[PDB]
Amino acid sequence: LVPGEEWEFEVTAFYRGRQVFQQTISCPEGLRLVGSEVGDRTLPGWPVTLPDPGMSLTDRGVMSYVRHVLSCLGGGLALWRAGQWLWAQRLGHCHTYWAVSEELLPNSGHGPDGEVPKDKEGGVFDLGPFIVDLITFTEGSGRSPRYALWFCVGESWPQDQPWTKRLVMVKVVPTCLRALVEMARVGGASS
Amino acid sequence: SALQDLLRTLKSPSSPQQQQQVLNILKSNPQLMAAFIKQRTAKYVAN
Numbered sequence: 001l002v003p004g005e006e007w008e009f010e011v012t013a014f015y016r017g018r019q020v021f022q023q024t025i026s027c028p029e030g031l032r033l034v035g036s037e038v039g040d041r042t043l044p045g046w047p048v049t050l051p052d053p054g055m056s057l058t059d060r061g062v063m064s065y066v067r068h069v070l071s072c073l074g075g076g077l078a079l080w081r082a083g084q085w086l087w088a089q090r091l092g093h094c095h096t097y098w099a100v101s102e103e104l105l106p107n108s109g110h111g112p113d114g115e116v117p118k119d120k121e122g123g124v125f126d127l128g129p130f131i132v133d134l135i136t137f138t139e140g141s142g143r144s145p146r147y148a149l150w151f152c153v154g155e156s157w158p159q160d161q162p163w164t165k166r167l168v169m170v171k172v173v174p175t176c177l178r179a180l181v182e183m184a185r186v187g188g189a190s191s
Numbered sequence: 192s193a194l195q196d197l198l199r200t201l202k203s204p205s206s207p208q209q210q211q212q213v214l215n216i217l218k219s220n221p222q223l224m225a226a227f228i229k230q231r232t233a234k235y236v237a238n
Contacts, residue, residue, distance in 0.1 A: 004215070008208045026208035131216075131223055138230040176212035179201060180223075186200045187230045 003028060005081045010178075012171040013050050015066050017164025020056040023048060024175065030080020032091070033153075033170060035070030043091070045078050050168070066167050069094060069154035077116065077151060079124075079172060086125035086149070086174070090116040097157035098124050100146050103173070105163055112157035124149060130177065138184045144191050147177035197227060 008026035011033070012019060025031060027046035034047045050073075053066040075091025090096050097112035099105075116122060125147075133145040152158060153168040163169050194214060217224045 006208075007212060008206065024206070026206070026212075127216075131220055135223055135226045138226045139233075175205070175209040176216060179203075179205065179209060179213050180216065182203060183197055183200045183227065184230070186202060187227060188234060189230070 001082075005083070007081045007086075008175045009079070010173045010175055011048055012173075014164070014169045014171070015053050015057055016059075016062055016167060017162070017169075018056065020053070021051050030078065030087075032076040032078045033073070033151075034076040035073035040075075043075055043078075045080060047076065050170075062167070069168050072154065077153065077170070078121070079149075081174075084127045085123040086127075087121040088116045088124045088149075089121040090118045094154040095156075096154075097152045099150050099157070100125060101148055101150055102146060103148050103171075103178075105148075105150050105169075105171070107158075107162050109159045109161075111159050112152070116151070125174075127177075134180060134184055137181075137189050138187060140189070142189075142191055144181055144185070144189075147181065148173050193224075193228065 006026060006028045008024060009031060010024045011022065013021040025046055025048060029045045032043060032045040032047050033050060035050050038047050038049055050070055053063040057063050072093040074093060077096055078089045078091060080087050088098065096116040098116055099113045130145050130147065133143065137144055149172040151170040151172065152166055153170060155166055158166050198210060
């Protein structure tokens with residue numbers, strides 16, 4: 001609720017492994033991934049509408065499922081910063097699973113870091129450990145710290161299968177963290 | 192000028208908001224700013 005921790009997020013959505021959307025928004029109340037009309041304002045956070053699968057996808061059977069998923073989003077998927085943590089909360093009918101990974105999610109079937117809670121927000125990213133490892137990275141640990149949040153919307157997490165077969169995958173990146181890692185890399189650090 | 196050389200390093204596109212947020216993380220984590228300053232000249236010819 002207190003200013004000074006506003007973060008810009010780059011949101012990239014994929015319908016069946018196909019990038020169909022990408023927007024960058026810096027909002028003090030964090031954001032909400034909705035799948036519709038943009039109305040009910042009673043909810044906090046800037047609403048980011050995922051596109052209707054019709055204007056990008058050609059397959060009509062797939063447009064069907066995605067449309068259903070996007071429709072069950074209701075309040076959406078809220079994400080915001082508060083303190084040293086990134087918080088997420090599910091406000092609709094679709095279970096959502098998350099995991100912190102590389103800019104490009106690997107099919108290293110390992111399972112999700114967890115499920116976004118619906119009753120109360122849950123922490124999905126801790127800035128503390130990130131900075132600790134960013135510093136050793138500059139020293140030569142050779143291990144770049146992860147900052148990309150990936151969400152599987154409407155289906156279980158793609159463990160034994162390629163995420164590109166999931167109806168709706170969302171990638172969220174805090175751009176300042178991406179920048180900090182790039183400066184450490186350009187400063188002379190390798191993986 | 193120390194912050195400017197770091198941002199200059201941004202060989203990628205950005206925005207005024209991302210830049211302000213990077214300076215904010217740095218202002219609240221002086222030990223991080225110290226690492227970037229130390230890494231800038233850590234490279235030396237050994238052996």
